[PDB]
Amino acid sequence: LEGLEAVRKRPGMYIGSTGERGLHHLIWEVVDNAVDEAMAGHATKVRVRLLADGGVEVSDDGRGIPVEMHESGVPTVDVVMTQVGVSVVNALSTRMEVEICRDGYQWFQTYDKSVPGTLKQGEKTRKTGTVVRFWPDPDVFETTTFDFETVARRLQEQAFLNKGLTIELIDERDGKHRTFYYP
Ligand SMILES: CNc1cc(F)cc2c1[nH]c1nc(Oc3cnc(C)nc3)nc(N3C[C@@H]4[C@@H](N)[C@@H]4C3)c12
Ligand SMILES: [Zn+2]
Ligand SMILES: [Zn+2]
Ligand SMILES: [Zn+2]
């Protein structure tokens, strides 16, 4: 967790600012990982929800973040959320939730002020994919309001670059919705 403490100590080092543009770094990172699964993991659908409480949910129907034991002796999902680019989202969020469908099972993990909980094996499923929820820390960010039009423009770009990918955007704050798809 030394990397995460470094991000929390100097957030602007990692996301440039703690204003609106800094806040949107977090949604870009999680969206990017979901969209990466379209080229790499045969995902057909990405969904982004702007939650009523300021949180964000991103989901894909890709391979699912690996849950197998990493060489560092913890589930790979914990390595991802502490070491890869998306670990900045974990560092600067009060909490994150991860749901994974892979290897014939649902899996659930939580991060509480970036600290991993205990990976839980849930029910059997033939489905695959990943859901990440995160709640930006208002102690870090001078604004916590995501901009629907800013997010829409990024998702339209990502649909155009990933032909056949459906991207759904839902604003739970006001009900606005958009679906992006290029054949
Ligand atoms: C909402 N969707 C979402 C959010 C998120 F924060 C991270 C991921 C994600 N979907 C993901 N899907 C996968 O499937 C993979 C990738 N590679 C292999 C070998 N197996 C399965 N892997 C993921 N990750 C591990 C590593 C990627 N290069 C990063 C992130 C993410
Ligand atoms: Zn990427
Ligand atoms: Zn493949
Ligand atoms: Zn596949």
Numbering used by the authors: 20 to 102, 123 to 213, 245 to 253
From the publication, what sentences describe this entry?
Using cross-seeding from crystals of the novobiocin complex, crystals of Redx03863 bound to the 21 kDa fragment were obtained, which diffracted to a resolution of 1.5 Å. The structure was solved using molecular replacement from the novobiocin complex structure. This new crystal structure demonstrated that the binding mode of Redx03863 partially overlaps those of novobiocin and 5′-adenylyl-β,γ-imidodiphosphate (ADPNP). However, in contrast to novobiocin, Redx03863, is more deeply buried and shows a greater correspondence in atomic positions to ADPNP, most notably in the overlap of the pyrrolopyrimidine and adenine rings. In the Redx03863 complex, there is only a water-mediated interaction between Arg141 and the ligand. Indeed, when we made site-directed mutations to Ala and Gln at Arg141 in M. tuberculosis GyrB, the mutated proteins showed only weak supercoiling activity and were susceptible to inhibition by Redx03863, i.e. this water-mediated contact does not greatly affect the interaction of Redx03863 with gyrase. When we selected for spontaneous resistance mutations to Redx03863 in M. smegmatis, the only mutation that we could isolate was Gly83Ser; no mutations at Arg141 were found, again suggesting it is of minor importance. In relation to Gly83 to Ser, the presence of a side chain at this position would cause steric clashes with the neighbouring structure and most likely displace and/or destabilize the loop bearing residue 83, which also contains several other important ligand-binding residues, namely Arg82, Ile84 and Pro85. We found that none of these mutant enzymes showed any supercoiling activity. This suggests that selecting resistance mutations to Redx03863 is difficult without compromising enzyme activity, which is a feature in favour of exploiting these compounds as leads for antimicrobial chemotherapy.
